[PDB]
C-alpha cells in the first residue's frame, strides 16, 4: 500500500537494471526491491556512470537487524528505510554515488 516512489516490491534484479538504464532515468536514479538472494531482506539498485563502462547499475544488500533496523555497512545502522534513503541522498558515505531520484516509469 501507497509505496514510496523508490519502492518496487516485486521487481526483479534484471527488471530493475532494465528500467534504471532506460530513458527518463539517469546517474543516481535508484530503487529498493525485495532481495532475490536473501529472503525477507531488501536490495538497493542504483545507476552510476563509470569512466570505462559508461552507464551501469550497481546493487547493494540491505541487511536487517534482529528486531528492526537496516544497514549497508555495519559502520552505520538506521531504524527504517526512510532514514537509510535520506542518509544516502545527503551523502554517498561509501556508496558509488549519492541516491538522487527514484526510478521513473
Amino acid at each position: 500500500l501507497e509505496p514510496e516512489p523508490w519502492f518496487f516490491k516485486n521487481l526483479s534484479r534484471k527488471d530493475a537494471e532494465r528500467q534504471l538504464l532506460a530513458p527518463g532515468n539517469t546517474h543516481g536514479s535508484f530503487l529498493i526491491r525485495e532481495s532475490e538472494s536473501t529472503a525477507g531482506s531488501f536490495s538497493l539498485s542504483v545507476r552510476d556512470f563509470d569512466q570505462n563502462q559508461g552507464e551501469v547499475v550497481k546493487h547493494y544488500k540491505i541487511r536487517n537487524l534482529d528486531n528492526g533496523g537496516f544497514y549497508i555497512s555495519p559502520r552505520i545502522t538506521f531504524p527504517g528505510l526512510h532514514e537509510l534513503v535520506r542518509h544516502y541522498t545527503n551523502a554517498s558515505d561509501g556508496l558509488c554515488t549519492r541516491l538522487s531520484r527514484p526510478c521513473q516509469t
Binding site: 538472494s37 536490495s43 547493494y60 559502520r75 558515505d93
Partner: peptide
C-alpha cells in the same frame, strides 16, 4: 553485489 557491491560493498561499501
Amino acid at each position: 553485489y557491491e560493498e561499501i
